[PDB]
Design an enzyme around this catalytic site. Structure first.
Site, PDB file in Angstrom:
ATOM      1  N   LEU A  39       0.589  -1.336   0.147  1.00 21.16           N
ATOM      2  CA  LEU A  39       0.073  -0.200   0.301  1.00 21.16           C
ATOM      3  C   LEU A  39       1.159   1.125   0.176  1.00 21.16           C
ATOM      4  N   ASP A  40       0.510   2.177  -0.603  1.00 21.22           N
ATOM      5  CA  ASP A  40       0.769   3.789  -0.950  1.00 21.22           C
ATOM      6  C   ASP A  40       0.979   4.616   0.351  1.00 21.22           C
ATOM      7  N   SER A  41       1.608   5.646   0.572  1.00 18.21           N
ATOM      8  CA  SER A  41       1.751   6.180   1.007  1.00 18.21           C
ATOM      9  C   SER A  41       0.063   7.533   1.385  1.00 18.21           C
ATOM     10  CB  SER A  41       2.400   7.399   1.446  1.00 18.21           C
TER      11      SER A  41
END
Lengths: 85, 457, 166, 169, 97, 55, 118
Positions: A39-41
């Site tokens: 998952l991204d920031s």
């Protein structure tokens, strides 16, 4: 309405699986969103907002940095709401 | 009949054993307070005469009953305090409260201007010793020095005034004799004659100027929040203003006109300061300036309506403000610092006291008619006949009287008390008794206060 | 803490978007439009331009700043039951129960005596453990977790490990 | 009785002409509640009156008349003025309550007419203006707190102003 | 340093030891003082005392003047012409000039 | 029951010697009643459910 | 009172020398916190602690009357203008109302017909 320890593990998992960002086989219970799940920031804040709205939205920005693992996020939500005796 | 039972209360404390003391001082004062309500309430067409002038009579004095009511009430409050001190000093102290009440019986009963004045100043010495000893805070000596600096510099001008009047016109002594009264012709020599009679009762009845006498005596309290009730009695101790304005100078009241104006800003600006201050006792001390300023406004108008409101307010303030000091006493005995911000939280620890907080705070406002509304409303209706513009000034005061009570409530309604480990025990049986014995006489005066507001009523 | 500044601005942007929109399908559409804005610029590393974009992010956020924000549930401050339905009797009041009345429900009284005995005995060990962890003079901002936790009991618990609930 | 003005005669009589329905529900309850607790309270009041039997006489209000006015007693003297000060104060207490009776007469005027109120009466409003004006100009109402010596000065002030106006006109 | 002054005292019992008390020292005397003699002055002076505050002391002719005024209203209306008030205290007294 | 209360005020207010601007301001408010009433119906009641809960 | 926009994300240095100063803020904060924490979590305490920040807070308002205000400047005279000023202000308000009333009593009667009060 009463909330149980099994209920916290069921409601958070169903909300995470419905997000469609991560596979049901990739994230189970202990697989972290930071590295293991993928998952991204921006996704970390998006998953935290979705999980809060489903149960009881009271998640501060200071605790959002500590909340990375779904097993830890379920425990932090239970601690603030005082669930499972 | 009120001479030599209070003087017989004096050897009672000395003769009684060390185990008793407090049981005798209270029980043998409550039955004495019963007899005051039994005998003094009777009136004919005008003022009577009980005896020859050693102690005279009552004209408009149910205020005597209030002092007899506080005769055991001060002993109720000083129970947790003076519990660890010497037994000989306990016997010494109760006699000093009795001596205060002894001269207070004398001053209200005696219908003189000469005998009244020397026993009016005989209440100053016992209070001085009561303030300067057993004071919990430092710099209590400033509260002692200014107590006799402000009062005596204003009251010693009565000796040059009162003796001057009796040298010219008959004698002041019997008062009901003093109807030889000649109208004052408004001369420059008569200017200081009026001022000297007033300035003595401009100190104990706090204006805007010369008002620092009061809060210093309350912040540097005599005993925690127990002997402050005697200082409430000193506030209503300036009742000579009712007698001087009526008898000595009825014609010349042009000099009264600036003094009403000085006390008019002693309503707004004395209430403004009482909003931010940290000390809980000072939030009662500055509110007590404004409620007693109402009388100074009233008396100098000299209209029959103002006297009805004033005499009611003297009794009203004597039981409401003193009750607020008992609430300040209950908070100080647990925390040991009168900071309002620190002591925060009722109902979590004190559930029953919170209802007594309401019945004491809201009485500063005009509730369903207790005695405070009856006191205030007649004064406001009297000021309109004086001048129409007064209610604009008086209306601002009605807003800040809500800023007295609710601000005292809200800063105690905020449920936290995180740092506080003390205040574990809720209340003693005598602690809640102070809350009842102050409020229930106010609740009984809701029904018929005919024998309260009575200067020919 | 530049990474925290981006996250806090993005967290505020999502919870402020729901006040402007009405329906849930419209909320998803505008969120993806916001995702098109922030993800495109975060990919490349910027030293001056990243702070310039963050100061420009104050605009648009201030143009649409106050439509009364949707703080619907029990949120810290704001509106709608912030610290409400709270009797919240502390442990200090739980010790001053009167005789001939504290006898009712004896299981709560017997357990609390064991909890108090556990705190009084471990406080000397907690003072040594807490006092040991010191950089020099004063702490450098933060709590003190147990390092040599053999038996049990962290250095500093009673209010933290004894909340009233809600 | 006697001192109270009261109404002349009370009218009202039951008609019941239009419709049947269930007659008058208020009148049906009036007959019902008359025997329910109105008759029981009347029986209890009669039982309390019968249990009284012997009662104290009580000689009512004391007289005490004249004793020479303050205007008659010339020069200041404490022995003479004291009884004169009591006489004026007793009259002032009565004159306060005289106004209160006529005040209650005007209260009766408002209710016993209702609809008319201002257009009718005519006597009670006129009697109020005759007494209050006499009370305002003679019995203080401008002379501050009550005093017998001040009242004689107030009466002399009104007399001197009237004599100056009568001689000029 | 004072070498004599440092001796602080902090002892607030209230519940710890006497269980039920209004004041410290001697529980047997305390019940007889805080709960008995305080409450006898709370009962006699406030309940039996209330039958003297406003309940029947006659009190400065408040009810007396009602019986006095009512008989004077009917007297000066039927026999007299002015309605109870016309001139105060002075009927044809000594003039100013 | 709004006709027996509200509608009798508006009809009486039209026939007056009083200010026209004061009358016209109240006439906008009588039509304003329908908008906030629908803000309870259309927004909170009607349409797709927006209650945020797992159960 | 704030003049422009509400100050929270506006006007700040971009991780310069202020970062060393911001770290110093937590150092003093925790120093006062740790001594508070040690005097809190013990069961044998019983009593409200001092906290010198609130003791000096009460001393700043109640005391410091004559140690302060020893240079009586022109600003104190401006404060005195708000002091005596309003007291002399009503002297030309109440007297003007009284002379309006008293002249209406004597010449051209303005007194009420049903005025039994006062």
């Amino acid at each position: 309405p009463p909330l149980t320890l099994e209920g916290i593990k069921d409601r958070v998992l169903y909300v995470l699986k419905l997000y469609d960002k991560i596979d049901p086989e990739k994230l189970s219970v202990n697989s972290h969103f930071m590295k293991d799940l993928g998952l991204d920031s921006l996704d970390q804040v998006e998953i935290i907002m979705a999980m809060e709205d489903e149960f009881g939205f009271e998640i501060p920005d200071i605790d959002a940095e500590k909340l990375m693992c779904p097993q830890e996020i379920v425990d932090y939500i239970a601690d603030k709401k005082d669930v499972y005796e | 009949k009120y001479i030599i039972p209070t003087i017989m209360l004096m050897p009672l404390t000395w003769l009684s054993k060390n185990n008793m003391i407090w049981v005798n001082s209270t029980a043998h004062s409550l039955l004495i307070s019963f007899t005051s309500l039994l005998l003094m309430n009777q009136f004919g067409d005008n003022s009577l005469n009980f005896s020859l002038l050693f102690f005279s009579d009552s004209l408009s004095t149910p205020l005597l009953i209030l002092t007899m009511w506080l005769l055991p009430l001060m002993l109720m409050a000083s129970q947790h305090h003076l519990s660890k001190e010497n037994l000989t000093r306990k016997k010494l102290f109760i006699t000093m409260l009795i001596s205060l009440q002894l001269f207070l019986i004398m001053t209200f009963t005696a219908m003189e201007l000469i005998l009244f004045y020397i026993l009016f100043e005989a209440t100053l010495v016992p209070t001085l010793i009561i303030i300067t000893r057993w004071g919990n805070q430092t710099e209590r000596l400033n509260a002692g020095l200014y107590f006799l600096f402000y009062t005596l510099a204003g009251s010693l001008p009565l000796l040059v005034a009162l003796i001057y009047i009796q040298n010219t016109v008959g004698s002041l002594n019997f008062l009901m004799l003093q109807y030889w009264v000649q109208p004052v012709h408004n001369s420059w020599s008569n200017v200081f004659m009026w001022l000297a009679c007033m300035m003595a009762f401009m100190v104990k009845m706090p204006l805007y100027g010369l008002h620092l006498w009061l809060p210093k005596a309350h912040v540097e309290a005599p005993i925690a929040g127990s002997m402050v009730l005697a200082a409430v009695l000193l506030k209503l101790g300036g009742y000579g203003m009712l007698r001087i304005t009526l008898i000595l100078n009825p014609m010349t009241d042009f000099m009264a006109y600036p003094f009403i104006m000085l006390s008019l800003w002693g309503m707004i600006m004395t209430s403004s300061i009482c909003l931010r201050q940290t000390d809980l006792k000072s939030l009662i001390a500055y509110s007590s300036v404004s409620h007693m300023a109402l009388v100074i406004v009233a008396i100098l108008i000299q209209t029959p309506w103002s006297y009805m409101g004033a005499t009611a307010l003297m009794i009203a303030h004597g039981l409401t403000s003193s009750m607020l000091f008992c609430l300040a006493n209950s908070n100080y005995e647990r925390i040991h610092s009168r900071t309002m911000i620190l002591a925060r939280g009722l109902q979590t620890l004190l559930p029953l006291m919170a209802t007594w907080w309401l019945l004491a705070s809201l009485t500063n406002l005009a509730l369903p008619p207790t005695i405070n509304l009856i006191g205030e409303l007649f004064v406001v209706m009297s000021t309109f006949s004086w001048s129409n513009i007064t209610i604009i000034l008086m209306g601002v005061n009605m807003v800040i009287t809500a800023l007295y009570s609710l601000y005292m409530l809200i800063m105690t309604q905020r449920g936290k008390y995180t740092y506080h480990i003390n205040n574990i025990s809720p209340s003693f049986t005598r602690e809640n008794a102070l809350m009842s014995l102050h409020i229930l006489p106010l609740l009984l005066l809701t029904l018929n206060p005919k024998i309260i507001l009575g200067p020919l009523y | 803490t530049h990474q925290q500044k981006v996250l806090r601005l993005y967290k505020r942007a999502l919870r402020h978007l729901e006040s402007w929109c009405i329906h849930r399908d419209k909320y998803r559409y505008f969120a993806c439009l916001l995702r098109a804005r922030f993800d495109e610029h975060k990919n490349e590393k910027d030293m001056v331009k990243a702070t310039q974009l963050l100061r420009e992010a104050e605009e648009e956020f201030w143009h649409g700043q106050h439509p009364q924000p949707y703080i619907f549930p029990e949120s810290p401050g704001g509106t709608s039951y912030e610290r409400y339905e709270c009797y919240k009797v502390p442990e200090w009041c739980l010790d001053d129960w009167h005789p001939s009345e504290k006898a009712m429900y004896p299981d709560y009284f017997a357990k609390r005596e064991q909890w108090k005995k556990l705190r009084r005995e471990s406080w000397e060990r907690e003072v040594k453990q807490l006092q040991e962890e010191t950089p020099v003079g004063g702490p450098r901002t933060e709590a003190l977790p147990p390092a040599r936790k053999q038996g049990d009991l962290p250095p500093l618990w009673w209010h933290i490990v004894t909340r009233p609930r809600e | 009785x006697x001192x109270x003005x009261x109404x002349x005669x009370x009218x009202x009589x039951x008609x019941x002409x239009x419709x049947x329905x269930x007659x008058x529900x208020x009148x049906x309850x009036x007959x019902x509640x008359x025997x329910x607790x109105x008759x029981x309270x009347x029986x209890x009041x009669x039982x309390x009156x019968x249990x009284x039997x012997x009662x104290x006489x009580x000689x009512x209000x004391x007289x005490x008349x004249x004793x020479x006015x303050x205007x008659x007693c010339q020069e200041k003297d404490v022995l003479c003025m004291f009884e004169a000060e009591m006489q004026w104060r007793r009259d002032y207490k009565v004159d306060q309550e005289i106004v209160n009776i006529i005040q209650e007469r005007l209260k009766a005027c408002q209710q016993r007419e209702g609809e008319s109120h201002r257009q009718n009466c005519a006597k009670e409003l006129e009697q109020f203006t005759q007494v209050v004006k006499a009370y305002q100009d003679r019995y203080x109402x401008x002379x501050x707190x009550x005093x017998x010596x001040x009242x004689x000065x107030x009466x002399x002030x009104x007399x001197x102003x009237x004599x100056x106006x009568x001689x000029x006109x | 340093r004072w070498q004599e002054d440092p001796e602080p005292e902090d002892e607030n019992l209230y519940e710890k030891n006497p269980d039920s008390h209004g004041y410290d020292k001697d529980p047997a005397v305390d019940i007889w003082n805080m709960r008995v003699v305080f409450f006898f002055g709370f009962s006699i002076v406030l309940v039996l005392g209330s039958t003297f505050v406003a309940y029947l002391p006659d009190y400065r002719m408040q009810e007396w003047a009602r019986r006095e005024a009512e008989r004077l209203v009917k007297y000066r209306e039927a026999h007299g012409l002015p309605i109870m008030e016309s001139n105060c205290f002075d009927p044809s007294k000594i003039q100013l000039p | 029951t709004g006709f027996y209360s509200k509608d009798l005020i508006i009809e009486a207010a039209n026939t007056s010697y009083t200010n026209a601007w004061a009358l016209l301001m109240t006439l906008i408010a009588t039509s304003f009643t329908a908008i906030y009433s629908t803000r309870i119906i259309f927004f909170a009641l009607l349409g797709q459910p927006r209650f945020p809960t797992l159960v | 009172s704030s003049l422009p926009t509400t100050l929270d994300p506006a006007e700040y240095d971009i991780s310069s020398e202020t970062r060393k100063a911001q770290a110093e803020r937590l150092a003093i904060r925790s120093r006062l916190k740790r001594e508070y924490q040690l005097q809190y979590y013990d069961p044998s305490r019983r009593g409200v602690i001092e906290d010198p920040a609130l003791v000096r807070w009460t001393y700043a308002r109640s005391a410091n009357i004559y140690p302060n205000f020893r240079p009586n400047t022109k600003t104190s005279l401006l404060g005195a203008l708000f002091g005596i000023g309003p007291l002399v202000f009503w002297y030309y308000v109440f007297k003007t109302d009284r002379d309006r009333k008293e002249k209406l009593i004597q010449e051209g009667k303005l007194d009420r017909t049903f005025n039994i009060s006062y």
